[PDB]
Design an enzyme around this catalytic site. Structure first.
Site, PDB file in Angstrom:
ATOM      1  CG  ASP A 125     -76.094   2.234  49.334  1.00 17.26           C
ATOM      2  OD1 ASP A 125     -75.664   2.087  48.186  1.00 17.26           O
ATOM      3  OD2 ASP A 125     -76.888   1.668  50.235  1.00 17.26           O
ATOM      4  NE  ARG A 185     -74.470   5.022  40.737  1.00 20.88           N
ATOM      5  CZ  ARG A 185     -74.165   5.382  39.632  1.00 20.88           C
ATOM      6  NH1 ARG A 185     -73.205   6.459  39.077  1.00 20.88           N
ATOM      7  NH2 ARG A 185     -74.705   4.781  38.397  1.00 20.88           N
ATOM      8  CG  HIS A 233     -76.019  -1.001  54.280  1.00 19.53           C
ATOM      9  ND1 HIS A 233     -75.999  -0.139  53.074  1.00 19.53           N
ATOM     10  CD2 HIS A 233     -75.337  -2.237  53.940  1.00 19.53           C
ATOM     11  CE1 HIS A 233     -75.592  -0.953  52.162  1.00 19.53           C
ATOM     12  NE2 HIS A 233     -75.124  -2.164  52.562  1.00 19.53           N
ATOM     13  NE  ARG A 244     -81.193  -8.843  59.002  1.00 19.24           N
ATOM     14  CZ  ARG A 244     -81.260  -7.766  58.459  1.00 19.24           C
ATOM     15  NH1 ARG A 244     -81.785  -7.485  57.214  1.00 19.24           N
ATOM     16  NH2 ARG A 244     -80.683  -6.747  59.061  1.00 19.24           N
TER      17      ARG A 244
END
Lengths: 327, 332, 327, 332
Positions: free
Chosen positions: B166, B169, B193, B106
């Site tokens: 998000d 939704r 996020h 990452r």
């Protein structure tokens, strides 16, 4: 329950869809039709059908995750055509993908096989629908869909030349510095390389362009290399070279057609329809001519007097089409 | 046609080819083009300029949109490898971003993204000194911080798509369960996020009724109805979509179009977007997280201070530490 | 304060309007323009100016009470033209109301007085605006506004024949069973009784109607009593008999024109513009001809070859207009 | 043109002159026509039929709209004195109503309205058995009850415009004061329309923050900021508009268009409209007041139960008594 404490139900759930659209085949083209239709507030429910079950659920869930940003309330999918039940319109984007080295008659005959296996179920679950055929070659495919379907000519329509006619008028208005709504012009006949631009009828702001330049669109055109019909056909071929599909553009064109049917606009679109007994054609075959589209499909066709050049190209197209179709 | 124009049109004014509502999208993969088609179908931009490094894909997509331009209201579609084509944009939408390889760190992915952003963000700012930059690539919170730092732009002007999709939704599903249009539901997901975003169950209300008043165990584990499932279902769907398909292209494109709307039209609507939270919500270092922001033509003009319950403050403040720990490993 | 506890301000209030429209005169017509513009999401700010201060505040407050249902955020009014400051467009619906028994030259000359007192302040506070003149008689009034204004011809536009041309094409499409977007047709020249329908250029779906019926629109027309130009002129006269104004229709037409300018559409509208040196006119005067409308006003005009009947009506109109204008 | 159509058009299907989304407006005064123009500019109806008793005004208005029909999407404008022209409407919008004369009794005005409604409502229901009736005339609460009782229609199908317009203005001004788009504000005004409507300060929230949590004296007299002014300002503006002008035509037309939207599109959005509240909010007789209703294609499908604070329950329950006392004087 929070719901029982917040809401007193007075009437039973009415969950019926009033403007349900099904899209068959969820590659780039079907998905471009999908996002275009969702974004123009055309369907109460969008149903997606494909054989690639995993990708299919993926697309449906991708659309659902953004549900707040479009007006369609119900998105569904499945490999089983029962999800398509009671559609106003079924858009067929599925169909054979021509393997390099395959003849034209072979590609068409594979499509007979595909359509034989999907069209009768489409009609089973959605007996009063319209079928919008979008896969290539659209003209002979719409003929195949119509034959298998058993439905009247009025309710089996191919997307045909609508997109290319739109691009055509658009470029005319671009070159003249004028919004496209000022420009009339049709491309008709067989979609693609052999399509006929009707230069005799092209007119802008109430002025037939051929009275300003009788050579416009011909070989004597002093700007012949800028021919706009050729620009339209070459562009789509270049896009397909680069991308594989004019997918955003076709999705836009299909959204144009859907809006005419669903909203009963009686706008004129050059779409693939049965032309037996029209325009000098004598056999059953589909070509694009200007059709009036509305809630019951093609309610009318527009009769145009083609110049001899335009009649010649148009009839040559029909001839080659019928010679494929006979087999 | 050149002779046709001379006989048909009589000019009174020279053609001004200036766009007063230009948008640039950087990256023409699935996310960029989903943003393009959504913006075009919503009548938002004068011009849409597309930037990418791959010549075929870039030209293919631009021409595809152009071939169907009769059907949207944007009138100019432009594209180029040179960032000159983006000049004078109102918004520049960055979807360019490295994809995390099998076994790639990452940290190393963010570092590859640092190098990308160091290549494009200066050019963008040079050609559009007054633009707002909308960062969409993942991981969005760290990437928006990097873009801002490189940009040298005011912090209010560099915005990450953050949790806008998000939360939308989240509200929509809360509306579904209750049988009510989502415009009747208020509900925020904020913070980092993805997996560690905080749902603000404390402030979820429908039609002016805080749902905690009707069931104080809402969103907890002791919830009998397990409304907690709705945040999980939101977070899970995004992983499921990627697993079945590969990416969340349509839904991010929808969310980006929603953000472009508020900014170009100066709506001053509230979105949970990624912005710098130093000195807000109890944070003390320069980092970006999603908090509810007023978005208008200048970008973030204001932020909504929500009192978070102790479970919400802790989840949130943990993400600020996560982001700060990543930024420490970061260089440049 | 609730606000101090709820919101942290990071940037100063940007309260500038970007698409500000002012409407001058708030009778039925100005108010129909107002609700039409509000409802089509065209203005950031709508400013209303009138001398009837009480009614004016009433209208403004009536619009404000419904603010949630339209996208314009700021509505303002006042008798003082300083409220009109920095408009993109100023729509002049004020103007003299012809007292029965008044000559035509008297009505026009009262309007010189009105315009002399309002037009220079319009230009003072809004130096880069466009002025859309809507009051009757629109053609000579637009000339008067333009002269007083000092602005180029490109930014002083009369509503002219846009409404009647639209109704014309609409009825053509109604009689043919086809959406209006398939129909080209213009009414040009002097608004009202003397307007010229361009039957030579009327065409539907790419077909010049005169090739189907060379008598169409003339005295030899076998359906002459159904003449659509006469239906358009009679209708407006009947509406005005009944109501006093075609107010909803003009408000709709003005909303059409505003959308072209503000959004830079380069659509073609038949509006009142300076026709000196065009179409055989030799003096300064305004008549409707097809203009390309965009963000800087009239960017282009369309040149049409009128048949001899059409040229005769058009030139007779100009002659009578100039003979009024000279006084 | 008859010969032109024969040479140009070739029919495949007989013209179906059936409208699938018809609306009728009864009354073509200022309120009716403001409703007409708002609905037409929002692409809601297939056909708009207009009914009125005055021949000139009716024909004038219909033709005015027709003369400009290129500019809206509704394709058929029809009008008539005979209620046959309204047949098969989805919604019938009643703006017909007596105007209160100088020194006319309120009771006698409602009684004149009883006579009017007894003349038109049976015809409406005969020609559109499945319509929803949207009652707009004043006093709306009593009039909607009268229309329903005469209609013999299910209660969910007869709806008064109620407090929808005042709540909308309430939210909008709350948004203004806070500098936020009104779609971020939740706030209801309910009960009797006009002077005695109840503002639900208890449930007013912006961006998921109940404003009572930030100032518990909000909406009371002990409020330092006097947010109480916003309800008064709403109620006062409507009287001011009538005093300066004569009627509140544009704003009611806007509010009616908003309601038509939810019903035709089956939005299931919540509106504070006038419906029967017997057995709801603690009322026990058949009367109509404004409460938050879910509106869809069947009319009121659901109602939102809000817990009212004791000041809110008392103001509300008083209006139910007022309406019941008027209904007692009523006959028929």
């Amino acid at each position: 329950t929070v719901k029982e404490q917040l809401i007193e139900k007075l009437i039973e759930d009415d969950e019926n869809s009033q403007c349900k659209i099904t899209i068959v085949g969820t590659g780039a083209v079907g998905m471009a039709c999908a996002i275009s239709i969702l974004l123009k507030d055309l369907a109460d429910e969008l149903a997606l059908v494909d054989v690639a079950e995993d990708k299919l659920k993926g697309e449906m869930m991708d659309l659902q995750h953004g549900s707040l940003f479009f007006s369609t309330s119900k998105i569904t999918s499945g490999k089983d055509y029962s999800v398509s039940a009671n559609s106003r319109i079924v858009i067929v984007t599925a169909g054979a993908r021509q393997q390099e080295g395959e003849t034209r008659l072979a590609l068409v005959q594979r499509n007979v096989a595909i359509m034989k296996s999907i069209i009768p179920a489409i009609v089973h679950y959605s007996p009063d629908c319209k079928i919008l055929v979008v896969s290539n070659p659209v003209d002979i495919l719409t003929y195949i869909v119509w034959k298998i379907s058993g439905l009247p000519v009025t309710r089996v329509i191919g997307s045909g030349c609508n997109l290319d006619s739109a691009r055509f008028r658009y470029l005319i208005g671009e070159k003249l510095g004028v919004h496209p709504t000022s420009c009339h012009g049709w491309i008709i006949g067989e979609h693609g390389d052999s399509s006929v631009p009707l230069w005799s009828g092209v007119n802008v702001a109430g002025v037939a362009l051929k009275t300003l330049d009788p050579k416009l669109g011909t070989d004597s055109d002093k700007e012949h290399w800028k021919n706009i019909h050729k620009q339209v056909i070459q562009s789509a071929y270049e896009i397909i070279k680069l991308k594989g599909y004019t997918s955003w553009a076709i999705g836009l064109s299909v959204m144009d057609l859907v809006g005419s049917i669903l909203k009963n606009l009686r706008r004129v679109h050059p779409v693939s329809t049965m032309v037996k007994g029209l325009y000098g054609i004598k056999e059953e075959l589909f070509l694009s001519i200007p059709c009036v589209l509305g809630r019951n499909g093609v309610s009318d066709v527009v009769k145009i007097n083609l110049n001899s050049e335009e009649e010649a190209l148009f009839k040559k197209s029909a001839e080659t089409l019928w010679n494929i179709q006979k087999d």
